[PDB]
Design a protein around this ligand. Sequence first.
Ligand code: NA
Ligand code: NA
Lengths: 152, 152
Amino acid sequence: MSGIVIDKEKVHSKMPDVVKNAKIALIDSALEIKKTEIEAKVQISDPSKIQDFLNQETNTFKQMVEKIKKSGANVVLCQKGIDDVAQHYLAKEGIYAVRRVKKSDMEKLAKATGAKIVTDLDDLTPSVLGEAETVEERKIGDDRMTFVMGCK
Amino acid sequence: MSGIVIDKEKVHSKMPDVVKNAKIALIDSALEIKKTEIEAKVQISDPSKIQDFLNQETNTFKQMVEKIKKSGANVVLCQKGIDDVAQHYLAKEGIYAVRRVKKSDMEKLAKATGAKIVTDLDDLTPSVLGEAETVEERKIGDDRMTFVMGCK
Ligand code: NA
Ligand code: NA
């Protein structure tokens, strides 16, 4: 596809404007921390270990987020939200990230670029990535969208 | 009092062995994070703000802990537990900290050194501190205790 338009913009300003030869990651699941799960770990914690836990979780999440960079990807389109700090990590890692991409677009992009839409970020092997000549921010009218061109 | 023995040891190894001219802080309350309170802030949080919160809390607590160093104190005897990371902060700040000091000892030390046992760590003015010539770790038999000598 010498074109697929996504009506969603890259999440951070400090993110790349154009991405040449993009390996694209497709995640079904939100790049976020599960409330119920960390509340419970806080609840079952030894009172003197509360901060240890919050710190171990700050590391565990950042690691979950780095599995994108480590799988080689330089573009990530998430079907759901992306935690704000997670958005920071990717902006630093220089990755083009998009959140809340419609399910239809996720599938449309899956076929077009050849990626496999994962949910569990551990199955994020560099084989499930998609490819495209360029991925760019584009502003039509007052919408900031993302063009996925040269779909391979 | 050319002597008050406390049957509790300084909390960390990297803490001072002897503290000359000690201004002593007495806290009724635990130097810990309240479970119920942070669980609720996690629960009411925008999903994309979970990590922002955990980070703001990591700072808020460290600041609560620094109010000891900032009140001038160089010795803190807490009547309850002290969060492990909080114990790290004090060990770095070079403060002699003791946790779970008996209530009777807290009062006994209050009179002897002239400090005011606070609960709310904001009332930790340098006026509520106690004084003593030396505060030292001491090992009698197989107990590691704390001697508060030269109580002024
Ligand atoms: Na899907
Ligand atoms: Na008391």
